[PDB]
Scaffold this active site. Structure first.
Site, PDB file in Angstrom:
ATOM      1  CB  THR A 187      -0.910   1.800   4.530  1.00 14.48           C
ATOM      2  OG1 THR A 187      -2.066   2.642   4.437  1.00 14.48           O
ATOM      3  CG2 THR A 187       0.338   2.668   4.575  1.00 14.48           C
ATOM      4  CG  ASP A 242      -2.605  -0.568  13.109  1.00 11.69           C
ATOM      5  OD1 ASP A 242      -1.659  -0.881  13.865  1.00 11.69           O
ATOM      6  OD2 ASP A 242      -2.499  -0.544  11.865  1.00 11.69           O
ATOM      7  N   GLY A 277      -4.297   0.881   0.302  1.00  9.75           N
ATOM      8  CA  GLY A 277      -4.440   0.614  -1.116  1.00  9.75           C
ATOM      9  C   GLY A 277      -3.630   1.606  -1.919  1.00  9.75           C
TER      10      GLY A 277
END
EC number: 2.7.12.2
Length: 287
Positions: A29, A142, A31
């Site tokens: 997501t 998020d 890295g």
């Protein structure tokens, strides 16, 4: 400071060559994340690898997430950084990313998550969001089941802060005022948590049969908020908590200090729930 590993409470002088690569982790997501084993002690940790020649848009979100993680060292509901290694071509970030996200727990259960587990999950995530706003003035932007981590010992923490702001996320969990803003987003994460709780408590995402991203946002604004069903044995406090977070008018949506006094929150702050044993049994269903 770099070049140190603090596994638990003991600080070890280490380099990248002191860890054995055991394969990739997750979906990448933020890295590339490796599962690695510290040869000096035997502990297994998660290590992010940021290459200096990599995508500059991805590298910016990695450094932004690391910045929030480093200054949140005193909050037990946020994943912690164990150390960093800076070479001439890479940056290695040792983090507490061990465990399984709530989205993958939902896929393995193939059904609803018990309320007693979601109660302890609600307490941890609300306190993590309340910590970010009060101590750092940061909003997450998020919040979703894939960013809620559970481990072997029964701990629950927030993890990804790649797009967190100092005061866009997935369209499926976007609050109404982030779709149609007036003229204010301090409570948009509260709406995202409400949708996540409905999805996990029922095993079904509330906005169903949408084939485009714009169709999801249309039903968020046009239809009534998706409430918790009343024929699954859910307690009155759980239904009351979800209805409060899913208030479409953000001006009438309760505050974090108001949410932290809800009877649903106060119950699972004291109730002893064996999250560790429930976690092991779900993990022991190979699929």
């Amino acid at each position: 400071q770099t070049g140190y590993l603090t596994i638990g409470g003991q600080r070890y002088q280490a380099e990248i060559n002191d860890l054995e690569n055991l394969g990739e982790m997750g979906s990448g997501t933020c890295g590339q994340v490796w599962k690695m084993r510290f040869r000096k002690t035997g502990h297994v940790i998660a290590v992010k690898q940021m290459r200096r020649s990599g995508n500059k848009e991805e590298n910016k979100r990695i450094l932004m997430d690391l910045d929030v993680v480093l200054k949140s060292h005193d909050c037990p509901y946020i994943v912690q950084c164990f150390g960093t290694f800076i070479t001439n071509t890479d940056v290695f970030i040792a983090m507490e990313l061990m465990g399984t996200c709530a989205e993958k727990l939902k896929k393995r259960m193939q059904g609803p998550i018990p309320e007693r587990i979601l109660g302890k999950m609600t307490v941890a995530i609300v306190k993590a969001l309340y910590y970010l706003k009060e101590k750092h003035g940061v909003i997450h932007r998020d919040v979703k089941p894939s960013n809620i981590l559970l481990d072997e010992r029964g701990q629950i923490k927030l993890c990804d802060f790649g797009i967190s702001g100092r005061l866009a996320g997935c369209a499926a969990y976007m609050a109404p005022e982030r779709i149609d803003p007036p003229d204010y987003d301090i409570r948009a994460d509260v709406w995202s948590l409400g949708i996540s709780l409905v999805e996990l408590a029922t095993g079904q995402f509330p906005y169903k049969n949408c084939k485009t991203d714009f169709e999801v946002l249309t039903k968020v604004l046009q239809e009534e908020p998706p409430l918790l069903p009343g024929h699954m044995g859910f307690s009155g406090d759980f239904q009351s908590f979800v209805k409060d977070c899913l208030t479409k008018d953000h001006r009438k949506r309760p505050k974090y200090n108001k949410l932290l006094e809800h009877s649903f929150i106060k119950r699972y702050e004291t109730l002893e729930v064996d999250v560790a044993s429930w976690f092991k049994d779900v993990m022991a269903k190979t699929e």
